[PDB]
Amino acid sequence: GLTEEQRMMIRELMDAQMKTFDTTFSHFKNFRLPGWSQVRKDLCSLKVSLQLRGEDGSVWNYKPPADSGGKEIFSLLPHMADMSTYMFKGIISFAKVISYFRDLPIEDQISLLKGAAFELCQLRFNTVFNAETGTWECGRLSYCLEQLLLEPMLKFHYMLKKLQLHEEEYVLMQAISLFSPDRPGVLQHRVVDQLQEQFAITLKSYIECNRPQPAHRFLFLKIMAMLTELRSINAQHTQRLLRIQDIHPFATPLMQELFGISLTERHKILHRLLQEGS
Amino acid sequence: GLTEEQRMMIRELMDAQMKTFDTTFSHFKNFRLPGVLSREEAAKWSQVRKDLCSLKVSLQLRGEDGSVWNYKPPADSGGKEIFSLLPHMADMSTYMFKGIISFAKVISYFRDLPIEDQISLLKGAAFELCQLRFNTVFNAETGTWECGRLSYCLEDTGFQQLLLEPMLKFHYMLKKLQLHEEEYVLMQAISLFSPDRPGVLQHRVVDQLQEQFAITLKSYIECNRPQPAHRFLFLKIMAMLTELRSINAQHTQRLLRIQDIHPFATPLMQELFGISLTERHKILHRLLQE
Numbered sequence: 430g431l432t433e434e435q436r437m438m439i440r441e442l443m444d445a446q447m448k449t450f451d452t453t454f455s456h457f458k459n460f461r462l463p464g465w466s467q468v469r470k471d472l473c474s475l476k477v478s479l480q481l482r483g484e485d486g487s488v489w490n491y492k493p494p495a496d497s498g499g500k501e502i503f504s505l506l507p508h509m510a511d512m513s514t515y516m517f518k519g520i521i522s523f524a525k526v527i528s529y530f531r532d533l534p535i536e537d538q539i540s541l542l543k544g545a546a547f548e549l550c551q552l553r554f555n556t557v558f559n560a561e562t563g564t565w566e567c568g569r570l571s572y573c574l575e576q577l578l579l580e581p582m583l584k585f586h587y588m589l590k591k592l593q594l595h596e597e598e599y600v601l602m603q604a605i606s607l608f609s610p611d612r613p614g615v616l617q618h619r620v621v622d623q624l625q626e627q628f629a630i631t632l633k634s635y636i637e638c639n640r641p642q643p644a645h646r647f648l649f650l651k652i653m654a655m656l657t658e659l660r661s662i663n664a665q666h667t668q669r670l671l672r673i674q675d676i677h678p679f680a681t682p683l684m685q686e687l688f689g690i691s692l693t694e695r696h697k698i699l700h701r702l703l704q705e706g707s
Numbered sequence: 708g709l710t711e712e713q714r715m716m717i718r719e720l721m722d723a724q725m726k727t728f729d730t731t732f733s734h735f736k737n738f739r740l741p742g743v744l745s746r747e748e749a750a751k752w753s754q755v756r757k758d759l760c761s762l763k764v765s766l767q768l769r770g771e772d773g774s775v776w777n778y779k780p781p782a783d784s785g786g787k788e789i790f791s792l793l794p795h796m797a798d799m800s801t802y803m804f805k806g807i808i809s810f811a812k813v814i815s816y817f818r819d820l821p822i823e824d825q826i827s828l829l830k831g832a833a834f835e836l837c838q839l840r841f842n843t844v845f846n847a848e849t850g851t852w853e854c855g856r857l858s859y860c861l862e863d864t865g866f867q868q869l870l871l872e873p874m875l876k877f878h879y880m881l882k883k884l885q886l887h888e889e890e891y892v893l894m895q896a897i898s899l900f901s902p903d904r905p906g907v908l909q910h911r912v913v914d915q916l917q918e919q920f921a922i923t924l925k926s927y928i929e930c931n932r933p934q935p936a937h938r939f940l941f942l943k944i945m946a947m948l949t950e951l952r953s954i955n956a957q958h959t960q961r962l963l964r965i966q967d968i969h970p971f972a973t974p975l976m977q978e979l980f981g982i983s984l985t986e987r988h989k990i991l992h993r994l995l996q997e
């Protein structure tokens with residue numbers, strides 16, 4: 430079985446997830462709505478329609494335009510920036526209530542969240558992804574996709590959903606991604622690296638104590654391979670986001686902070702959120 | 708053929724329609740849309756839910772980029788969700804009525820009547836002329852009123868069930884007649900010049916005027932359509948106009964009942980509903996004056 434400290438480690442991560450992940454998206458408000466070639470082709474694969482279900486029973490449905498070559502390909506990017514910002518704020522709170530993360534220097538806290546923001550966001554998105562309908566079910570909001578598995582982020586969501594992970598395995602993936610000692614700007618490398626290794630050992634122990642079926646053979650090494658793949662997808666899409674923001678500005682002030690290539694000065698919003706409570 | 712007096716009478720109506728009917732709804736802007744995300748009073752509330760459930764549509768809004776916003780209405784759950792579209796339809800009705808006001812203003816026959824009879828005629832005919840213009844953009848195949856970039860599609864709340872609703876039976880039957888523009892605009896004049904509206908004083912004048920429009924329409928049909936096949940088209944049109952007046956009274960009473968428990972009417976609509984004739988209709992009076 431799991432050791433006591435591993436039991437406590439999982440318990441703290443799960444408690445953090447429950448306290449900082451609003452799976453109903455009920456507090457997502459005041460978002461915007463609709464009024465290089467490799468990017469355009471990739472943006473075509475991820476084309477989604479937006480459905481908003483009101484409490485009264487009504488449904489607003491947005492179908493995106495077709496690719497005509499103009500600025501029509503970015504009609505949903507302002508909205509997704511507001512959704513990404515809301516999602517990241519939950520990620521910040523998730524990290525803040527973790528004991529191992531809260532004790533790191535403030536700049537390493539900034540650097541870790543900066544390097545893992547997209548990765549923990551995609552991990553939480555996967556838990557609301559419906560692989561049958563191709564829809565991310567975000568409470569009252571739904572995002573339904575329109576060979577398309579060629580796109581890496583799309584392929585990632587299908588591959589990860591196929592593993593049928595438990596909540597504990599998702600939250601341990603989040604901790605492994607969060608405590609990456611090789612993020613730019615990290616100073617406490619050995620401290621963060623020692624923390625990451627214990628999360629990975631905890632995940633391996635959890636899988637062996639709860640997943641005996643042959644369908645879950647090599648599941649731990651599959652998860653670690655998925656985490657390395659997600660870090661690659663992070664680099665591609667962050668770089669892709671900078672090109673788009675250059676051409677058509679869409680990023681919220683908090684997102685611009687993530688995209689900037691002193692530490693607390695360049696990240697005033699993230700710095701304030703790390704100092705605020707919950 | 709038609710006499711020249713009937714010819715110029717049609718020319719004036721067609722000219723009126725061309726200048727005041729925004730058929731593409733291009734200048735319908737800044738409208739409201741549904742938001743994103745006792746004892747005898749129970750009888751008044753129960754009655755309104757029956758009024759609002761017979762007529763249910765989804766709203767479609769097409770953007771210039773090619774995108775499509777679509778609104779699907781909620782189901783009757785007992786709350787205010789049954790009024791989710793009344794703000795929009797208040798803005799649409801107001802926009803249409805102002806076009807109807809302008810339509811009557813440029814007809815010389817209507818301009819020469821006393822201002823209080825003009826108020827009384829537009830008050831009694833506003834709904835009817837609005838439905839008549841709505842029918843010209845009504846698609847009977849898809850059950851959709853196509854108002855430029857806005858579309859209102861009937862929901863299958865069967866069809867023989869929907870045909871029971873007189874306002875929907877009106878739009879399907881009138882569309883099936885496949886009327887010309889001239890016949891629609893003559894229906895509008897016959898409806899506008901109804902001598903039996905409340906508050907009209909020059910009834911004999913308005914009746915003579917209505918009869919000349921009706922005779923003009925009857926003559927138009929005899930001279931412009933194959934004789935045997937359209938032998939009763941004029942009588943069908945007049946029968947449609949007679950039913951439209953009953954639909955007018957029926958739906959005007961529904962609006963007053965809804966306004967009682969859930970106000971939604973714009974100021975110009977409040978004047979039309981009854982919420983000196985000139986002092987009770989200051990907005991409509993001002994629009995007729997300019």
Ligand SMILES: CCC[C@H](C)Oc1ccc(C(C)(C)C)cc1NC(=O)c1nnn(-c2cc(C)ccc2OC)c1C
Nearest residue numbers: 475476477505506509513517546547554565666667670
């Ligand atoms: C709600 C579910 C969205 C699905 C999972 O996905 C999309 C599907 C469609 C589309 C478009 C608009 C192209 C149709 C976009 C996206 N997804 C993004 O817009 C996006 N997802 N994560 N992040 C991001 C987040 C951080 C913290 C930091 C950096 C980040 O980007 C590097 C962003 C900006």
Ligand SMILES: CCC[C@H](C)Oc1ccc(C(C)(C)C)cc1NC(=O)c1nnn(-c2cc(C)ccc2OC)c1C
Nearest residue numbers: 762763764792796800804833834837841852859958959
């Ligand atoms: C543009 C397509 C709408 C179709 C044709 O129709 C409806 C379909 C659905 C609905 C609801 C909201 C119930 C789903 C309403 C309505 N229609 C009205 O809301 C309405 N149509 N004409 N008028 C009206 C106008 C005047 C000048 C004077 C008086 C009038 O009402 C007595 C009004 C207020």
